[PDB]
Amino acid sequence: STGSATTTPIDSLDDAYITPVQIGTPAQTLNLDFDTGSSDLWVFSSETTASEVDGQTIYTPSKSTTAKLLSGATWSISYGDGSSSSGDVYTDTVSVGGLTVTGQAVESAKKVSSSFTEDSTIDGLLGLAFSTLNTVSPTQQKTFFDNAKASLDSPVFTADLGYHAPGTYNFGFIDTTAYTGSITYTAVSTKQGFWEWTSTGYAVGSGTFKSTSIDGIADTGTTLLYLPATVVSAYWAQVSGAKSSSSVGGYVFPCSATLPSFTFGVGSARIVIPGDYIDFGPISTGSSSCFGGIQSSAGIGINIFGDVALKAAFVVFNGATTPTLGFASK
Ligand SMILES: Cc1csc(Cc2ccccn2)n1
Numbered sequence: 001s002t003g004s005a006t007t008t009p010i011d012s013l014d015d016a017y018i019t020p021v022q023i024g025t026p027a028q029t030l031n032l033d034f035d036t037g038s039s040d041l042w043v044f045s046s047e048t049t050a051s052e053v054d055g056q057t058i059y060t061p062s063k064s065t066t067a068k069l070l071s072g073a074t075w076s077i078s079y080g081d082g083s084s085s086s087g088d089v090y091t092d093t094v095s096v097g098g099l100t101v102t103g104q105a106v107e108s109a110k111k112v113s114s115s116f117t118e119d120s121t122i123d124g125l126l127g128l129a130f131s132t133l134n135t136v137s138p139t140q141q142k143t144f145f146d147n148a149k150a151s152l153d154s155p156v157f158t159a160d161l162g163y164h165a166p167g168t169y170n171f172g173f174i175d176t177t178a179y180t181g182s183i184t185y186t187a188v189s190t191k192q193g194f195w196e197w198t199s200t201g202y203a204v205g206s207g208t209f210k211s212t213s214i215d216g217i218a219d220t221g222t223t224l225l226y227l228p229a230t231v232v233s234a235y236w237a238q239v240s241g242a243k244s245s246s247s248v249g250g251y252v253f254p255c256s257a258t259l260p261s262f263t264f265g266v267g268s269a270r271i272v273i274p275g276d277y278i279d280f281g282p283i284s285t286g287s288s289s290c291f292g293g294i295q296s297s298a299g300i301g302i303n304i305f306g307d308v309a310l311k312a313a314f315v316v317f318n319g320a321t322t323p324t325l326g327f328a329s330k
C-alpha cells in the first residue's frame with residue numbers, strides 16, 4: 001500500500017503545515033500537524049475543555065462506529081516550545097492520503113496549552129518520530145507510520161514541504177519526479193527517539209564551505225533552523241544591522257535586508273536554503289525589525305533542522321530495520 005496527502009502552510013509565514021487526516025467511521029476529517037520530532041497522534045475532541053477550544057475541528061469518538069476506549073490509558077506531552085496537551089486514548093481507523101491503519105491510538109485531548117487553543121488551524125498532531133517517544137501510559141502506543149510500515153510497498157515516508165505553497169507527504173514510495181539529481185542518504189541514530197543525523201558542515205551565501213560535524217534532528221514540527229551559536233553568528237554577521245535581541249528572543253534583522261542563502265552538508269552533497277526562506281517577517285505588526293529563520297540552539301540542548309531547512313529539500317525518512325535519512329535538492 002501507499003498514501004499521498006497534500007500539506008498546506010497554515011499562514012503566510014509557513015509557521016506550520018497541516019495535512020488532512022480521516023479518523024473514524026464515518027470519516028471525521030481533521031487537519032493535523034505532521035511532526036517528525038514527536039510520537040503522539042493527538043486531537044482536539046468532544047472531551048477537550050470547552051474554554052480551550054477556539055475554532056478547531058474536533059474528533060467525537062461517540063460518533064465513530066469503529067472507536068474503542070483504550071481502557072486506563074492516558075497521555076501527556078510537553079513540546080520544546082513549552083506547549084502541552086493531555087488526555088485519554090481511543091483506538092480507531094485512521095487514513096492519510098488513502099493509506100488506512102486500523103486500531104491506531106488516537107489520543108483525545110482533555111486539556112491543551114494556550115498556544116494550541118490560539119492556533120485555530122491545527123486540529124492536533126500526528127507524530128512521526130520513533131515510537132519509543134510515545135507518551136501513552138501504561139502501555140506505550142505506536143505511531144501511524146510504525147503501524148502502517150509492514151503494509152507499505154517500501155518502509156518509508158517522504159516530506160516535500162513547500163515555500164509559501166502546498167507540498168506533499170507520501171507513505172510507502174519515493175516519487176522520483178519530485179526532486180532533482182540524486183538522493184543522498186545519511187546515518188540515523190534512534191538513541192533519543194528522533195530522526196537524528198550529522199550534517200557535514202555549512203556555508204553562508206557564496207562563502208566557502210566549512211567542514212564540521214553538526215548533530216541534529218530532522219523535525220517537521222519545528223518552524224525554524226536551530227544551530228550552534230558559532231554557525232548562527234557567522235550567518236547573521238553577513239546581514240547589515242542583524243543582532244541577537246534578548247527582548248525579542250533571537251536574531252532580528254532589518255526588514256530592508258536581502259538575506260544570504262545558507263547551505264548545509266549531507267555527506268558530500270549540499271542543500272541550499274535560499275535567503276528568502278530565512279525571513280519570518282516583522283517581529284510585531286508594522287515593525288521594520290524582522291525575525292530570523294536561523295536561530296541558536298544553545299538554550300535547547302539539540303540542533304534542529306526544522307521546516308526552514310527541510311522545505312529546501314525532498315526528504316526521505318527511511319524506516320528500514322536500520323533507519324536512514326535521505327536528502328535531495330528540488
Ligand atoms: C510561531 C508558531 C509556530 S507554529 C504556531 C502555531 C501553534 C503553536 C503552538 C500550538 C499551536 N499552534 N505558531
Ligand code: NA
Nearest residue numbers: 223249280291
Ligand atoms: Na515567534
